[PDB]
Amino acid sequence: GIPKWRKTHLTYRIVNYTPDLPKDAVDSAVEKALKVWEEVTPLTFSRLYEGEADIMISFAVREHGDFYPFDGPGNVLAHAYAPGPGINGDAHFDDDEQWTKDTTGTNLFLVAAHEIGHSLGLFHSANTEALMYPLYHSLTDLTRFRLSQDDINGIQSLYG
Amino acid sequence: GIPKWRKTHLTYRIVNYTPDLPKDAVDSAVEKALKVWEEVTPLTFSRLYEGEADIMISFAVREHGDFYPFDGPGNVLAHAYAPGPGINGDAHFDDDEQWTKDTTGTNLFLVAAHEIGHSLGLFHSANTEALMYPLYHSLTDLTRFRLSQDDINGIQSLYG
Ligand SMILES: CC(C)C[C@H](NC(=O)[C@H](CCc1ccc(-c2ccc(F)cc2)cc1)C[C@H](CCCCN1Cc2ccccc2C1=O)C(=O)O)C(=O)Nc1ccccc1
Ligand SMILES: CC(C)C[C@H](NC(=O)[C@H](CCc1ccc(-c2ccc(F)cc2)cc1)C[C@H](CCCCN1Cc2ccccc2C1=O)C(=O)O)C(=O)Nc1ccccc1
Ligand SMILES: [Ca+2]
Ligand SMILES: [Ca+2]
Ligand SMILES: [Ca+2]
Ligand SMILES: [Ca+2]
Numbered sequence A, B: 001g002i003p004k005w006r007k008t009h010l011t012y013r014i015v016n017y018t019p020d021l022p023k024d025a026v027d028s029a030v031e032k033a034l035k036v037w038e039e040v041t042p043l044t045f046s047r048l049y050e051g052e053a054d055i056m057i058s059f060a061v062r063e064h065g066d067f068y069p070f071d072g073p074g075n076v077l078a079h080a081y082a083p084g085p086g087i088n089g090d091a092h093f094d095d096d097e098q099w100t101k102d103t104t105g106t107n108l109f110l111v112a113a114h115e116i117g118h119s120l121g122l123f124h125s126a127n128t129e130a131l132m133y134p135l136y137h138s139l140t141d142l143t144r145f146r147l148s149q150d151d152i153n154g155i156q157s158l159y160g
């Protein structure tokens, strides 16, 4: 079993942008989310501006080309696929959500970090404070965010 | 993508039993859980008493031969793998839980039905009342259980 990338150097591409935030803010959020994982593993990510990258990142609403259509405001916020070729490893964000860079609304960085966890092969955690918990919740202060030991052990068991 | 069985006739085997309930009660719970899905799809399940079946069902505690050890009482109640050969499609139940046939404790039938959903290729639902919701909750009256329309649409989109 054990679904994981057979390589440690991964590429990603931000296929399109959400109009909720300025371009630079989307880039920063995605970059930060990736750094969260690079800090505790031997993985590195390189950005591509064309073609197909291992991790294709996009914002879409309702039916968007795959088997799982989004559901409008609320409920499912995004979805990501486990490691593998093609659609696998990709992360889609529901643009019917209002993506933010702060504590209000739906914070892009927080959700992006979680989705990338799935793209790397992680399942959910039972720890209510773990990044990989199933339900989203906003933080009072973003600087209070940190990976729980559960998150670290999980990703390290897969890579190193 | 779309992880699903390439066949509609599946076999299952109850590899071992939990001492929490009498044998006949475990068989009944598993049988009922399978019937839940047979009622809304063209799938059929046949029981095997030896060798490897597509869906291997077992009760275990802590480290049990796979990559994901159980965690003692509470937290993760069980885990099942998506369709595929070998360990894929299998469902493991944490025996550190007290499995019951009624509304108290951890109801085996309810959890088994959910796990089988995963074994068939389903992901979680955002509907708090759907069988495929991420968090377990006991019912006041078992006869009040029924698949939500979300559960039905999901399994039917995969099979028929
Ligand atoms: C019952 C759930 C639907 C509830 C819903 N949750 C989601 O939307 C999740 C949110 C993920 C998340 C969790 C914790 C933190 C966090 C924040 C701060 C922090 F400090 C720590 C952690 C951050 C992000 C996104 C998807 C859902 C995948 C669903 C299953 N599916 C379908 C599918 C299709 C294709 C591929 C895979 C899959 C697949 O898995 C995922 O889990 O990745 C939720 O909370 N909604 C919500 C919350 C508040 C307000 C409004 C709505
Ligand atoms: C944050 C969660 C951990 C919380 C926890 N949830 C679980 O344990 C789930 C329970 C499933 C379930 C949900 C609803 C109903 C129901 C009941 C009545 C009804 F009317 C309708 C519905 C029935 C069953 C089982 C696993 C967890 C998979 C975890 C991720 N992992 C690891 C992994 C390893 C290998 C393979 C795959 C996977 C994989 O996915 C799964 O989702 O299948 C919970 O609730 N605990 C709890 C609740 C109450 C008291 C004590 C504890
Ligand atoms: Ca991909
Ligand atoms: Ca949504
Ligand atoms: Ca939006
Ligand atoms: Ca199997």
Ligand SMILES: [Ca+2]
Pocket (backbone or CB within 6 Å): B070, B071, B072, B073, B074, B075, B076, B077, B094, B096, B097
């Ligand atoms: Ca447990």
Ligand SMILES: [Ca+2]
Pocket (backbone or CB within 6 Å): B018, B019, B020, B094, B095, B096, B097, B098, B099
């Ligand atoms: Ca037990």
Ligand SMILES: [Zn+2]
Pocket (backbone or CB within 6 Å): A064, A066, A068, A079, A092
């Ligand atoms: Zn999608």
Ligand SMILES: [Zn+2]
Pocket (backbone or CB within 6 Å): A114, A118, A124, A132, A133, A134
């Ligand atoms: Zn998730």
Ligand SMILES: [Zn+2]
Pocket (backbone or CB within 6 Å): B064, B066, B068, B079, B092
């Ligand atoms: Zn297991």
Ligand SMILES: [Zn+2]
Pocket (backbone or CB within 6 Å): B114, B118, B124, B132, B133, B134
């Ligand atoms: Zn589940």
